[PDB]
Amino acid sequence: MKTLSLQSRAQPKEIFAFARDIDGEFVYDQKIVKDENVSYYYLPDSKIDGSIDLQAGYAKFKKIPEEKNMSDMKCLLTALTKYEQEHNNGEKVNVDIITYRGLMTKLLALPYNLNDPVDLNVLAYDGQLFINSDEEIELARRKEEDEHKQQSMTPEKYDHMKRCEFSGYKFEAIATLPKPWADCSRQQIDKRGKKMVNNYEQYISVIKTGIGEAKMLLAGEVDCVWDYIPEDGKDVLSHYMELKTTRILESNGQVVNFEKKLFKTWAQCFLMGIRKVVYGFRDDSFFLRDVELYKTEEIPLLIKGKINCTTALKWYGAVIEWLLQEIPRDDTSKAYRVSFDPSTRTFTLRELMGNENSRLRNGEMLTSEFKQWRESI
Amino acid sequence: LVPAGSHMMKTLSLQSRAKTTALKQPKEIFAFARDIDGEFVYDQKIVKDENVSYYYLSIDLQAGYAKFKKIPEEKNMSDMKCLLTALTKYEQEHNNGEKVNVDIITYRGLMTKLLALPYNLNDPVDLNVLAYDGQLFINSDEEIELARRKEEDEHKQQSMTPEKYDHMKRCEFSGYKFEAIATLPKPWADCSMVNNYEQYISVIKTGIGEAKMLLAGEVDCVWDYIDVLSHYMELKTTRILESNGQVVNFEKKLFKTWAQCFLMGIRKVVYGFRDDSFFLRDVELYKTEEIPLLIKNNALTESGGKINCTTALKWYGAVIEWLLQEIPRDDTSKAYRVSFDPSTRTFTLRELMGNENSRLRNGEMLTSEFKQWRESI
């Protein structure tokens, strides 16, 4: 086991996308993903008047079982395989690390969320590091946390919490359209507040980026398009936006808690090259009362221990460099666990058992089809 | 344990839309005709001198119904053979022995089905497509068409009274009767039973986006004299507009008429309006270019929903661009099926097996005469 002191200090572009459909199946064709799997922002000021009910339709929420909603490296590799075959001249993508934005967000946000655990699996294959959350650990963590909530909250509060979760998806539904306005039917526009809401559908952008000298492929869910998707398909990232919801702010204490969320939102968007985020603010009856659009670049200054985004990024840089330094890049006989333990506040890198390596390399992280592809090159 | 889709099939989103592009001006390059005896006429002088009608216009549109000379519908399917016969003659005699300079060769009616699709989601489409001599040839499928009309007819017997079934046949006759009573066989100065054998077919060069296309289409009459397209006119009939429901019925027809005329560069359309007793009560002249605004300004309604001609055209542009992108132009070893399935609302492109390819290339679509000609160039 190796240990990285917490005191350690060191232009994104989308290259492909994929989606999960309403039935939980994955969609890989680039054209169809762009044509019918990403929505467009539409929320006129006239409707931010307190009439929009973000808990309406809760009972028919189509919710994916959490066991099928963990970060999945397999679909990422399936999409990557297609990209390499069809758009990278049959060559492997030129990065050092392949992972999900949400996992990197956990690393970036760590210095100011020392109460949150982190557990990541890392393994070297074909000269690249593949990083994902651990299925077993994650599933158990989610189960434990929900069971704890059910047990420690009144029935009313627990149901209220579930409705808050729902309201985020509901906000996305009532603040977006499936196509540009000019290509929508009147029914598609006028009847969005009644449309069934689901969390099966996801649009996943995969970007090439990096930090310091590290090159990274990062996959992340994107909520919508702010204006349009460039016809020539260039610099599409700058056209995306995130959509969040939170409670109205009625006191100083609530504002400080909002800054903590803002930090996490900055981390998510910054890593992904997303330049805009809209927050919807709702009351305890779930009515939409205010909306605010933030530029990602200004969030650090809207935030006023003491959160420092620069320090966070220097820490993140140090973690990434450390992994690249400490994990033998061409040794495929081992797998590693990167862990942050909140009870001792230690950030650790350890070698997993051979059988854990076997599990990861033969299904959980790497797929047979991806390995066969990379072998064939 | 069954694939979600065939590995030999690709899907186009119904939401796909091309950017609006410059209007293309169609131009006639040759014509051919089918005579009263059902024989084809290819000589340009003879076709123009003997096979063209001229507009000239109580009147009972079901009169003479008893003698309607109706060609057997299985002898009236769109025929690539006659088109290729006419095209060969054109290439030999007027194009300096070179192939016509287009990407796609097909019939107007088939393209109309694609253009009108967004507002006709219950109507199936099935087209055969194949690459030959650097060009795509597109026709309906003979067997599918045969089965489909019979299927629909059985469905009618099964759902209609003998009288209403009879009423539907008289409605069909009334259109041909209107043409007969509203035209002369020659210009007035030379004029000293109803049938659907006689057809005058204009073949035009046109385009959409970057695609160049040859389209063959029946033309009803000349409005003044033989830029020949600008001298043609379409003739249609429909029931008088005595209720909102009839306005609904008319709008669907008027949109299809716009699509047909727009694609062919026909600039004028006359509708005859008839009552229950099939008396002609009103006649209205339209310019094709004014139809989209008439439809837009109609409060009554029916991308599904309100018909929008611009949206239709953007869909059509997307379809044509997609076909040209997805079907290898220089591979003559394969044939394709383009299909819209109303039950699933999916638009797909599927590679046919070798024996279907052979059937199309060796008689049904390509003729031996046409292939020998193109080879000799």
Residue numbers in the entry:
A (entry chain B): 2 to 11, 18 to 311, 322 to 394
B (entry chain A): -6 to 50, 58 to 192, 203 to 236, 242 to 317, 320 to 394
Which of the paper's sentences describe this entry?
The CaRai1 and SsRai1 structures are especially similar, consistent with the 58% sequence identity between them. The αC helix is absent in AgRai1 but contains more than four turns in CaRai1 and SsRai1, which also have a longer αD helix. Therefore, AgRai1, CgRai1 and SsRai1 have a distinct 5′ triphosphonucleotide hydrolase (TPH) activity and do not have PPH activity. AgRai1 again showed strong activity, while consistently weaker activity was observed for SsRai1. At the same time, there are substantial differences in the positions of the helices, the connecting loops and even some of the β-strands among some of the structures, and these differences are especially pronounced for the β4-αA loop, αC and αD helices and the connecting loop, which form one wall of the active site pocket.
Rai1 homologs share several highly conserved sequence motifs, and our structural studies show that they are located in the active site region, mediating the binding of the divalent metal ions and/or the RNA. We have found substantial variations in the activity profiles of the Rai1 homologs, and discovered that some of them possess a new 5′ triphosphonucleotide hydrolase (TPH) activity. The overall structures of CaRai1, AgRai1 and SsRai1 are similar to those of SpRai1 (16), KlDxo1 (18), and MmDXO. Each structure contains two mixed β-sheets that are surrounded by α-helices.
